[PDB]
Symmetry: D2
Subunit: 251 residues, 4 copies
């Protein structure tokens, strides 16, 4: 409890699965939270299921929407004060090999998975630097950021981009003493909407040959590592990659 | 000599520096070559300086231009026969931190560095698969694909994407027995015409803290590794990353 | 608090610096702790400074001493019950390049840094498996396990071995459902007793060219990540590497 | 041809499989070669099957034998002149998980796989530095140096050690302008005599879930990459890892 005391966090795609879990644990640790999503209907209900308006609120926003990012930060700051933590968790997947990926699919996935993370990270640095907030930007990546998958071409590209782009940002912040850390989280297959949208994915990735533990993880598995990265407990961690994949990339 | 016998290669951005060196060594090894770039002035002059039309030719093209990619393959195949080797070397850089990167700069760099490589790789697989050519796609990455640089935000992103996207393509090709290999080359600092126009550039790059050897490489350093990857000598190498950085990433 | 409720942990080299910090946080989180070292004086004094005998105790032991490992587990189990957590933190360093390393120095460093971790890990698996303890083995590595250092030849070797050997153990435990997780922690430069004994050491370590943040970390920086890995919060994390180096390996 | 003109190489375990292939390609490229083996039953037959005494010879030696290393360098230098290339290829494997590994098996495997490579690398640097030979030390590693295997505990450890230890050596040599490069080769599964003796070995290694290409490699696959690393073609490559695993580590 209170591991995130005084923190003010923004979690994109925090109305379901992983995002929702992170929001729940964040509030549980004393942080003010603002979750985002493109569906206001479910948004409001998700925030309320986690806590009261004084601890968590919802803000309709598409991570690929650049201008919206500024409005998202203004609303969050106006409601809870200066933002200190950002979790770029919103993302989509396309079940296509590089060979069979259409340019439309390619641009659509990168708009969210890459441009969106870029927009959030860029603005996050500008808004959270030099304010003694112990700012932390957590960029949700994936095991798909370390290894490839024959049917996740576009996805693999976006995740590999986020992985290294985050290091660049981490270095710049550290070298300029911005008081902003940047790190990536690389979830292995986790029981969530994105995976439960990928035909037979959970069954396939439960096989011992894919996930050594013989089962996939749960949203809280990612929420806990995010709490650590959001808290001052990891004040010396920046530009690092934290994997929680049940052994997937160990073999 | 003849380490690339019978090969037909396409080299984007092969009219200068690294690209030109790869083209030179490729022809030298018996491969038919087609180099590209948007500048026909230097392009046509470059091809002729390497060899005659029967061994090497120039094709004006912007790697970011999707439709052009099909015309590029048709022209090459029409001149030398079925393409068997593709080197995605064309790329640009922006000297900006993630924080100071404009969306215009971001999209412009990704259009060439990411979309361009995606377009080439996707079309390459479709055209070079299942033809007993011993097809090989070499995606030029960088050390900036392994580690970040505070002032190369966008660049880092595109190189990180190419790095993992290439593994995806490598896997799909192998698993489907397409007879197509996909690997990435990660050059460290290389002494090129552009580098010479920047006062103190090579100087800073040669600092022991950056490049342990105390000096940067030359175009041929990258050409030689590309020869190996283009030849049947590396028929068992796919989805791998080959670094030639003077020890940059060793420390 | 109580993030390690019911846990029984063994921490080698837990009488000073990092080890002592891990022990402090562990007890603080409700875990019973047994620290080890070769100096009884400092050891007993250390345990008592952290807590009472019912929560923490000391056991004189050399991690390189194979037989002692069994006595260490028996004493810990006899005092607090079945061991569920093992932190292989004891290690030594030699300031020598590979070229100038004597065979005696080489064997001496590997005896502790490699054999010692092997002994603890091997026995740990045998003793902590299949007991519903949520067992966790944390092998202390280093940034020197990812990158090399011209003056830490032997050290680099032992850290590189621990890094991959741990993945092997992690996989075997997961595939056999031993209820035992294995992960490595890779600290960057940390303000340890040794570092403070070397005039100007923290200075060289703090150079931006080495640690981007401009300063080294503190013992608690490593203790916090160890708490996460020891708790059920990371039940889906195994065979992974967690880095806390102030940006050292990011560049 | 003549890609290793003037080179004088030593290849440990060069009387069979990979080692023999490397020796064959080296001589074929103009290098003088000395192959070693712990045993002498095929040493002469092997060298003679590759070429005449003026191009290749055999020297009985156990890589774990420290003193023998000096005699090996003297014999080679006496026969062909100053050694310029060293390939630490001799190694052994134990099919045991970390949990089931005996201390005897542990020490035995490390003596050859780790100590042996250390002995060769250390002496190599001392003997080949500052002589304008374009010296190159190639330390044979494995995919088991990047990822773990539940039944190769000790093996994983030794390969992870060689992987990082090599980087240390590479840095020291580069920083001190020793004119010695150090790199590692990480073969995936390779069809070797030993493999043919294990029933169903190639079958299990050819599973798509293990090797995406659906088949393992051959000795020449490793010989070719070694030629590149031994020649001046890779004068700017040092401290790097070169993987040829048929896509094993790509997924
Ligand atoms: Mg580095
Ligand atoms: Mg893998």
């Amino acid at each position: 409890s209170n591991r995130l005391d005084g923190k003010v966090a923004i979690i994109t795609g925090g109305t379901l699965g992983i995002g929702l879990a992170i929001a729940t644990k964040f509030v549980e640790e004393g942080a003010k939270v603002m979750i985002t999503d493109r569906h206001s209907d479910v948004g409001e209900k998700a925030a309320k299921s986690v806590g009261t308006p004084d601890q968590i609120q919802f803000f309709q926003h598409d991570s690929s929407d650049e201008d919206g990012w500024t409005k998202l930060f203004d609303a969050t700051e106006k409601a809870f004060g200066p933002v200190s933590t950002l979790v770029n968790n919103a993302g989509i997947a396309v079940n296509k090999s590089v060979e069979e990926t259409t340019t439309a699919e390619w641009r659509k996935l990168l708009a969210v998975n890459l441009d969106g993370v870029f927009f959030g990270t860029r603005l996050g640095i500008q808004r959270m630097k030099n304010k003694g907030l112990g700012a932390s930007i957590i960029n949700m990546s994936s095991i798909e950021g370390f290894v490839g998958d024959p049917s996740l071409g576009a996805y693999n590209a976006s995740k590999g981009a986020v992985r290294i782009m985050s290091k660049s940002a981490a270095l710049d912040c550290a070298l300029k003493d911005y008081d902003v850390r940047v790190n990536t989280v690389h979830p292995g297959y986790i029981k969530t909407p994105l995976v439960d949208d990928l035909p037979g994915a959970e069954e396939a990735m439960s096989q011992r040959t894919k996930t050594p533990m013989g089962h996939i993880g749960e949203p809280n598995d990612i929420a806990y590592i995010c709490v650590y990265l959001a808290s001052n407990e990891s004040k010396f961690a920046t530009g690092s990659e934290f994997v929680v994949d049940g052994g997937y990339t160990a073999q």
